[PDB]
Amino acid sequence: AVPAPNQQPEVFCNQIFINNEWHDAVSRKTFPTVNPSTGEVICQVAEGDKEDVDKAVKAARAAFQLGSPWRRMDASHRGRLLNRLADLIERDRTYLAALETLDNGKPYVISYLVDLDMVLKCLRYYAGWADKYHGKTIPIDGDFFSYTRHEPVGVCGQIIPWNFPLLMQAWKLGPALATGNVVVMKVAEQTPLTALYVANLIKEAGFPPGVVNIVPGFGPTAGAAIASHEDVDKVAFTGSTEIGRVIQVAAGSSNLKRVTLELGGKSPNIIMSDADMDWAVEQAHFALFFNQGQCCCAGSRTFVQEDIYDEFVERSVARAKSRVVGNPFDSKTEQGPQVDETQFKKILGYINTGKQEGAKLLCGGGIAADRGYFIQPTVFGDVQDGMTIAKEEIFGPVMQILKFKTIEEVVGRANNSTYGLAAAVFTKDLDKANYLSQALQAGTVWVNCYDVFGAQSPFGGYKMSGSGRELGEYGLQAYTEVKTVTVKVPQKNS
Amino acid sequence: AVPAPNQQPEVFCNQIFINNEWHDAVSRKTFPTVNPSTGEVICQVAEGDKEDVDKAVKAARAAFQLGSPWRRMDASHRGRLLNRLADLIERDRTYLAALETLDNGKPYVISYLVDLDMVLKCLRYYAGWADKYHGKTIPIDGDFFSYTRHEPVGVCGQIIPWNFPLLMQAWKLGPALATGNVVVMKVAEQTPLTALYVANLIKEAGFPPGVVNIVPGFGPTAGAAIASHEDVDKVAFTGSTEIGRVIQVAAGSSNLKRVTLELGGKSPNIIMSDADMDWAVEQAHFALFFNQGQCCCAGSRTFVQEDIYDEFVERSVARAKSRVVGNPFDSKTEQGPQVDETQFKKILGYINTGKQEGAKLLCGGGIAADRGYFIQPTVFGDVQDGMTIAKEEIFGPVMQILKFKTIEEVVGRANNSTYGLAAAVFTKDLDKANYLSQALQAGTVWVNCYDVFGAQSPFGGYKMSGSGRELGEYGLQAYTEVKTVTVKVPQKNS
Amino acid sequence: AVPAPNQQPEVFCNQIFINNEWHDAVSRKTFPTVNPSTGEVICQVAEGDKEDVDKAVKAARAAFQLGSPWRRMDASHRGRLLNRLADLIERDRTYLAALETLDNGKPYVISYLVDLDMVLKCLRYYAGWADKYHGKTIPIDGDFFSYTRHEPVGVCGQIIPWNFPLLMQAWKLGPALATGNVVVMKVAEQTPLTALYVANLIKEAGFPPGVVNIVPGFGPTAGAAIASHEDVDKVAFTGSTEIGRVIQVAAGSSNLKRVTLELGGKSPNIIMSDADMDWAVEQAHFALFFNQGQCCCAGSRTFVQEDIYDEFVERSVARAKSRVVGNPFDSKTEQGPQVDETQFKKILGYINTGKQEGAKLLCGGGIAADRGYFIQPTVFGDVQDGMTIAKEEIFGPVMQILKFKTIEEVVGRANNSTYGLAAAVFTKDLDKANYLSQALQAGTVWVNCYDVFGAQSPFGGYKMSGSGRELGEYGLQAYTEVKTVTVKVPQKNS
Amino acid sequence: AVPAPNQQPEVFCNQIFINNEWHDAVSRKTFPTVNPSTGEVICQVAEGDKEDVDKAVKAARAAFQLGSPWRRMDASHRGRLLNRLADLIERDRTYLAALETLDNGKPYVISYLVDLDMVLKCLRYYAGWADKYHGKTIPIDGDFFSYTRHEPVGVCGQIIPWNFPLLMQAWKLGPALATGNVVVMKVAEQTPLTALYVANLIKEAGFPPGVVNIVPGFGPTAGAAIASHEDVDKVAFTGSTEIGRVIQVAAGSSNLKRVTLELGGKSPNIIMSDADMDWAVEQAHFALFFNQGQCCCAGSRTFVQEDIYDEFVERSVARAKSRVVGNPFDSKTEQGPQVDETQFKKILGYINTGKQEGAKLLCGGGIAADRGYFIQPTVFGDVQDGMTIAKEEIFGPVMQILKFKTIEEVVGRANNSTYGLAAAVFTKDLDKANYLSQALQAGTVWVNCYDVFGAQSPFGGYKMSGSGRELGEYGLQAYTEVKTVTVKVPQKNS
Numbered sequence A, B, C, D: 001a002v003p004a005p006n007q008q009p010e011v012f013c014n015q016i017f018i019n020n021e022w023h024d025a026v027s028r029k030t031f032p033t034v035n036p037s038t039g040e041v042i043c044q045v046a047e048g049d050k051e052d053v054d055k056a057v058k059a060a061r062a063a064f065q066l067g068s069p070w071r072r073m074d075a076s077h078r079g080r081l082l083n084r085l086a087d088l089i090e091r092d093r094t095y096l097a098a099l100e101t102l103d104n105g106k107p108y109v110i111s112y113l114v115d116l117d118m119v120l121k122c123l124r125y126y127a128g129w130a131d132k133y134h135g136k137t138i139p140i141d142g143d144f145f146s147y148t149r150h151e152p153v154g155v156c157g158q159i160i161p162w163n164f165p166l167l168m169q170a171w172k173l174g175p176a177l178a179t180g181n182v183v184v185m186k187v188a189e190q191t192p193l194t195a196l197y198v199a200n201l202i203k204e205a206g207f208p209p210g211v212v213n214i215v216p217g218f219g220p221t222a223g224a225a226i227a228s229h230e231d232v233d234k235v236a237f238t239g240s241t242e243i244g245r246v247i248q249v250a251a252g253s254s255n256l257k258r259v260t261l262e263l264g265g266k267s268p269n270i271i272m273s274d275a276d277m278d279w280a281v282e283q284a285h286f287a288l289f290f291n292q293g294q295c296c297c298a299g300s301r302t303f304v305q306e307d308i309y310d311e312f313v314e315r316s317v318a319r320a321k322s323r324v325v326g327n328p329f330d331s332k333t334e335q336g337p338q339v340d341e342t343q344f345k346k347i348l349g350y351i352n353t354g355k356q357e358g359a360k361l362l363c364g365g366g367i368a369a370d371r372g373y374f375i376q377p378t379v380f381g382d383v384q385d386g387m388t389i390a391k392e393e394i395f396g397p398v399m400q401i402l403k404f405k406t407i408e409e410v411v412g413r414a415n416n417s418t419y420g421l422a423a424a425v426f427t428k429d430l431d432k433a434n435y436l437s438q439a440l441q442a443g444t445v446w447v448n449c450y451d452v453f454g455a456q457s458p459f460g461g462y463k464m465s466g467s468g469r470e471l472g473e474y475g476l477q478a479y480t481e482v483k484t485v486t487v488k489v490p491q492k493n494s
């Protein structure tokens, strides 16, 4: 049950958000954001740069001052505010889902039923943590009373990508606000609209000015200004491995701010011969193609045991050929366009790369429409470990199917990667599942399922896929600064 | 009750430790380690460099392979091994305390009663954590069973300083080994001997080859090779803020290895007018002069309330004048030499700066002996916040005494620093203690005490004094990689 | 800012609540509930007995069956339902606060600002815990995967008193529902109305039928039927020490159901000579007189240091003399009537005993009105430890002031009691505060405050004041049944 | 590799242990303890009664007074003492194993390799918990600092059975001492020797006098005196359901002391048709026959799916017939005698009942030797749910094999019991394992294994099999009394 969408939602927010108010960039510069389904400009947005970031950081620092409304507010009340924000987002769910689709390209039905639902669940989950992340009382040696206070890390710079605009914003705001930090968020230049509207809801919810500040703009400018800022205490980043390095270097070169990163991957989806065929085929399709293939944890290396390889491939190809590509506002559409021209070209390049290196093109492989950035669902068979399409994140509707013989062999091949964000195993056998979940070097291992996220379960990468974890109780660790208080007492007793 | 020290303990280990074997450097080069009390060379030590680090990392990686003895060992058994190492260290306590003094300069009585005791307590505390750092079972939405596995982060690079050679080594090995990680440690060129001898005990305790590897050598060579290694998963560093930046940049520039840092500070020790005079004077003396002033958390900014300033200063000067400086092996010696000539000259430079900038030299101020690196206990009065000696870490027996009037004033002055490792408050008033402990921006706030460490309580810095925490349950966080396993189940029930 | 109350609120619910439906007692019998301010009957209420409890238990058991809506419901959704129930209670806040006052006697202003506020806070706090009480993954020896599931204890019998009708219902429902249990609640015969209306809100909120069942009626009938029921898995009781014994014996004699108890106390409020006089006097007054003295943790033993005894007593008498007793619906009323005639007479009897035993009657001591159960605020001075009023819980507006000399002395006298629910310490000294808080044998120790409750902090008794804790994370322990699952795996690795 | 046993170990301790000293009973009475293998008296043991328990409780209370050596001792030192005790038990391992076998009857090889190993592991595990069971710092509403202290519950009465004398003592002492409590232990009259010798080791290890007191004697006398004592704060009991009831009633009728119970069971072991036959048969044999069938969690209801029933039974009967019964000191003996004449007769009675009720006797069924309490390994086939041997705990070498058809059917049958201590599932299917482990109403569910205990994983029963959990972190909960300290502060900040 999905409410009919407004296929041309009006844009109400397109400026820089600081101290609960809207501002043009100091330079007065604006940049166009494009609708990927048509290739047309939606509207212009204030182009924030260093000077704007400076104003936002000063506002955040002021809201974080000892004795301020945000610092004195009961933890339980921060929880109330998050719950209020969630209620406001739900009130505007239909509008937000349509705006998300307009700026990003994902199907409206998905923006509505998936993205928005997950935003609401993330915020509501974290609202509950606001007054429950306890410090400790410690039985230290000697005549002392020792305890720890879980204080906020402080001014948190949050840089997010364009694949899940609203959800990425919620994943960042939820834990940061639940623990009493203040935020300077830099949204993606490709999808700034939905996050800016949410800023209006943050003000409406009652958050004190300066608690959340949003600066739309580009990376090397606004993003880098946050990473290198001398008064930003912590930075959280989700995006490319390349920029992840740039961020960590900027943090180390400036004030040693704390850093957490969520980068991409080349996640292996292992299908054992005893797996439920119909289920594994559908889930492998979902694992790769979901969100136009623009998922950090996309199952981009589909390993299939030799005995079921031929049948698995045949079914996967049929499924890929039936996938409906089109207007994301049409209910029948399964796949919208890629986010922008840059990604579009990059994917075309990877497809040509696959053909050049000898991977068997089974279907698709080309542009799916004249207007917009639509690419045909593409499947490569007989992919080998050394191929570039088997190693690098394509971030498009391009599936790699690899053949394997033994469970010991597949463990080694799946783990032979600098990435380690996620992995999956499809099998009916108890021992195979436990052997593989333990052996796989990945942040999340799904068993007989894929892309199953819960606000309660942590997510993050091993190796080069990132550091730190988001979601769950773990998502609060990077937003907390630990203080030990040790007091001399007359006579310590147990 | 301290056993007679061997004033010239024999050196048994002076090479690179890899796979439980001793190796010369690939280059065959060695460097001299000096006795700071005489300025004479104790012995030569293998000079490890990049190639030696590469050998160590490969050995560590092999020992960490799935199915290896270290990976399969019961968690409780890792605890047994840590307890066995502790027992071996206790057996060789008299010898290790003397060797520590010889290479570092600290008083033998202190090496024996403080350093060795703390090494033993740290290892025994962490031995207990080996089989108790649980993952979680999570009530995720939908028909799934979700849980987390707390796995070891992997190959851990550990770079440590010279101020507490043995203790720093135990603070690093304890949590790392308790959680099943493998180590490549780079000890300080000024004090490599005791850590190398402990490597012999690690082998004797029964730890599998490659679990702990030690590479003595210089920083820009061996240290940087670890920080920039493509196969090191995590790096923990303790030392200068300058090198802390270098380490974080190296991590970002290489493989995005996880990073934790423990840097210096300029910790404020606050004496309110209602403090117990005698206690505060002795504690402030200890707070600054302990370990030849070579403590990351030295109370180097002694703020004294105006009403008790004159008396506090008088008593402090008397205590500093009575402090016995001399041969560390003599039972009457309270202060040994500084670690090396570089530190020695750096401190004298700071003292000359203090004099030039207008601080009032109350006592000391010069060299304490013709041989070795001895410096007279120095006290500066009427110190102002803008003075060099009030801003920069001196790391020597140089005390700064500043005057203040109000509690709000002292809070602001204490917090006006880029450092935030520790702080202390001496007062008899409940409210003043609670106000200050909450307001101070420091990792550890001591109340009516100073330098009170316990393996049970975390330690680390705010701001530029570091990131991450060591000791306590918190010390296990940076040594754990979290994996989420989400399994589809027939029908989830509470 | 309190909304004008309806001094004669209409009663909508007065029957037995089972399976989201209203039922008359099987016997068809009813009992009157009286307005303590006038002594008149408000209305009749179904008199539940054993047969009614049996129907309730069967309904709860059915709702708890594996595969039922309540068992399969996402933990996060149980949280949504608790939040919805809180929203409904807030919508009807004015009405419920009035109904509470009518049936109980407490001032409407307090019912509204305190009771209803705490009910909302408690339900909202527990709503947040619903999907966060994790089980554990455990590093057991051998080739096994071991973990724990935190399952609901099951059918929970909850017997509550009349002093805080709504709050007590919330304290019970919150943790029980957050953890997925089902409830058979027996409300006090003196104050059944507000809880019965909340039952209507539980249905409106959407809780499945049978999840919460409420049986109004007497103790030896309905109460005992629950405690002795062969199919009730856990019983939680709040009330007299006498009935607490009966409950534990019934549990042991039946099916060994789990038991938690919150009984009375004779809590010591200790005023040191260095305390803030004005604050201590007002807080000591509140500590004893709050809610007509009908608080389990009432500071009924006011220990005052000899140097400030006279002045403290004088100020306390003046405050007690000016305390407004009258119609609870009038905004100026500070104290309403005692709950019923039985309590009224028992309190007067204690006052008579106090006079007989030699305590100095300083003010009050008799009936405050001709109609209703109003008693004058009474203060006894020079009370001795051996006096009946110094040992037994009076549960009325009767204050005992005792004199002491030393801190060591007061610890012994404060601890010489079979009760140990709470205690307080008023002092400006840090060491005295820590010395006493550690030494006092009580579940809650307040320092420079009293009756400070938070849904985040646990509450419960030491000794005969009870067992187990309510509120906070601890409040979930007694509502969870722990299951260990240990699975054989091919090869265990860290 | 088991050291040759002394088949006639000398007895050194046979009196009441109070204040680290040995005492005769006040009455001077003694009782004989018998060697079940021969029926002959080993020696006389002091017969403790109420008066001796009173002396013990006073000693424990004195040792628990604020300021005493035990109360002031650093928590880490409590860990050192537990580790020291384990070292002494390990030193005397061969002796203790032989004495255990002599008094209890179990094979020496098992006493040595299993019981003693588990005792050592349990004590060393808990030694590690001594300084790690943290309290909390809580973000309560308002201007307050609120935290909890995890204090010792106090004087703990521990009543243990005769099936695992040394292990049961360790399971009780480990958590109790790790948390700073004092103990009054009542060992089983059938097996008092090993526990008494351990008391000598407790003294040798350095535990303060009164911390551990042991009173050998009968149940209705010494045991009941502990359960009803007005100065015992908590009682932990392991034994029959019948006495568990008596204990809880005694607690409720006396001082409302806290209670935890570990009672019997009639644990179901479910073999699905897809199970590994060889492994399932061996494990089912072990599950039932381990320790002469004297295990609380014995797999006494072996459910076997119909398709594999015939083969499973034939293999089971073959294994039972080959089980070697004889002198427990002989290396080839798998089964020793039952603990005493009472159990011996009770088991023969259950066998008679099995024959009378129509269960198919497949092997054994009678006495296995003319001297000693030896019983033949007995197997009953075609057992039905309504049979006495299918419902009551036999506690002997008598196996019940039942046939089932579907997974839904077996869940209902397995759960249709007033017991719920443990259960097991043997299957290769991932879904069947998860479905069953979730559905079974038991404290511990083993998958493809049985009797897998670890000091790290909790153990306890559902329903009438008990309340509370032992082992793991959970084992510390019942030995902790929670105190909330809430302090008024000038201004609370996050």
Ligand SMILES: NC(=O)C1=CN([C@@H]2O[C@H](COP(=O)(O)OP(=O)(O)OC[C@H]3O[C@@H](n4cnc5c(N)ncnc54)[C@H](O)[C@@H]3O)[C@@H](O)[C@H]2O)C=CC1
Pocket: D159, D160, D161, D162, D163, D186, D187, D188, D189, D217, D218, D219, D220, D221, D222, D223, D224, D227, D238, D239, D240, D241, D243, D244, D246, D247, D262, D263, D264, D295, D296, D343, D393, D394, D395
């Ligand atoms: N859960 C278990 O592991 C065990 C269960 N049992 C069950 O109990 C059945 C009967 O064996 P029993 O030796 O008679 O067990 P029991 O429950 O009577 O005695 C066990 C312990 O409780 C003490 N005790 C006995 N009567 C007491 C009383 N009135 N008050 C306080 N303590 C008392 C005993 O002296 C011994 O220390 C066994 O056949 C078996 O079914 C027996 C041993 C262990």
Ligand SMILES: [Mg+2]
Pocket: A240, A243
């Ligand atoms: Mg880029």
Ligand SMILES: [Mg+2]
Pocket: B240, B243
């Ligand atoms: Mg340097």
Ligand SMILES: [Mg+2]
Pocket: C240, C243
């Ligand atoms: Mg009564």
Ligand SMILES: [Mg+2]
Pocket: D240, D243
């Ligand atoms: Mg018995």
Ligand code: NA
Pocket: A033, A034, A035, A036, A102, A103, A104, A190, A191
């Ligand atoms: Na766009």
Ligand code: NA
Pocket: B033, B034, B035, B036, B102, B103, B104, B190, B191
């Ligand atoms: Na040296």
Ligand code: NA
Pocket: C033, C034, C035, C036, C102, C103, C104, C190, C191
């Ligand atoms: Na009433």
Ligand code: NA
Pocket: D033, D034, D035, D036, D102, D103, D104, D190, D191
């Ligand atoms: Na015996």
